[PDB]
Symmetry: D2
């Protein structure tokens, strides 16, 4: 029913959630990042005794990709155990997503397979970015 | 919000920028928060040798306000030295703002005094929030 | 060292600061108070977020408050929590922020009964990364 | 001459530095993490226009490992272009390392291959950790 790449995205994010390290919130989250060439990098939240030091599924996935040399992203899907709410990315992840482009898709899903799609631009209007430090020239 | 407050808020934000500790970016930023009862808490960005450990002006101000017992905010103004564009809050700050409501105002200014106003909701659509964990 | 008077003021201040803690997620309130060179005290408490990574520790709330007011000379900082049988220790992120402003100052890790362990920033963060590494 | 695992760590850390996304500080850092079963996970610092949203090499590597299901870490090496100074992990990274043990090694290096090794414990004494949050005490 859904395009093949969307199927891959949803399945990978749901699978990625199994590796979540969240003994404090018991709120497992998984993510699957799709690059331009078709490769997928997965991620999950990894908390810390000192809450502020944890990391979200999206950034774990984006950080993995970049460390591997991939900066061209097409889309990223997110999965959680919230059955009645589309899992949405926090502002911090939106900012990191934005560092690598505003024109890519974020699939906010539910366990049943349903989802909402918004671009990074829509998720982060009038975004602060590289231009602020006059880095685009 | 009362224009009397808006002005005091905008000035406080620029004044706060003078304390900025940003020897790495050399991009100082100030912010001023207005609570529901008219009290104003300001803040500035404080960087660190290891970049990830720095903090933004908005959060410095919000964190200050909360530590003083205030959690009901009406607006927050931001000021920087960037001439070409209105200084807007990074996603992390938008998420901290959201933690305490989506209906308040964010004043994104330019050094000359002009600005654009947007609510926390408009800056962080379809947000993740407290209700996700309740 | 630091006079028992300032230490008591720091101690009472951190404990009092802990009352404002915003921590509905962990329900682990923490308070902190730092002493500047001129004797002024600034306090803070942890402030969490629905998305855990966006919270902040009590020490950084205090330090950032101090700096925002123009103070960057610290003599000592005291931390307090509800942990009965354990001295509350600052996390690594806070130690690194403390280090940005010196390594020779004192950190007081306390218990709810007033007992404490004191260590310098240098001792809590040895062979540290710092501003000097970016100059060279 | 160093033990094979040390050579691998040193070399991987050096190679991972090439993927560093650090246009703001222009200070590239690489890290390599050795797990108990011998697998190595690399990472690099990934900055953001808004400085606070950046991530260090050590955590990029640790998060990669955990996302893949590895929590038993044996050692991690760090590399930078700092010629006459062993690159040291920031306090934030030492806290993340500590979440997964205090008794493993950290190799702080220089480009010439020389290094200083300390355990997580020595780099983060009287640390705050998971047990401080245990329900019963
Ligand atoms: O969309 C997202 C919302 C939240 N989280 C993670 O969920 C836990 C609770 O905030 C934390 O571990 C937090 O990082 C994500 O990883 C993604
Ligand atoms: O030494 C300290 C240890 C932890 N914390 C705070 O405690 C909660 C649980 O990690 C989080 O809110 C965390 O920030 C401090 O504020 C100080
Ligand atoms: O809206 C804002 C944009 C950026 N910053 C700060 O500016 C520096 C460059 O990213 C960093 O110190 C960053 O924290 C703020 O304080 C507020
Ligand atoms: O040991 C380390 C010290 C610093 N960093 C990174 O170097 C840049 C300067 O703070 C930042 O990008 C910072 O994250 C590392 O990744 C490792
Ligand atoms: Zn996030
Ligand atoms: Zn910010
Ligand atoms: Zn801390
Ligand atoms: Zn680090």
């Amino acid at each position: 029913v859904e395009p093949e790449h969307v199927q891959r995205l949803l399945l990978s994010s749901r699978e990625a959630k199994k590796s979540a390290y969240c003994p404090y919130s018991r709120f497992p989250v998984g993510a699957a990042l799709l690059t331009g060439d078709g490769r997928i990098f997965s991620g999950c939240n990894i908390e810390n005794a000192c809450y502020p030091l944890g990391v979200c599924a999206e950034r774990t996935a984006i950080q993995k990709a970049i460390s591997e040399g991939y900066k061209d992203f097409r889309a990223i899907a997110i999965s959680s155990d919230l059955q009645e709410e589309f899992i949405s990315p926090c502002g911090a992840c939106r900012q990191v997503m934005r560092e690598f482009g505003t024109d890519w898709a974020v699939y906010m899903t539910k366990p049943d397979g349903t989802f909402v799609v918004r671009t990074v631009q829509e998720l982060l209007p009038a975004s602060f970015g590289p231009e602020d430090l006059q880095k685009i020239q």
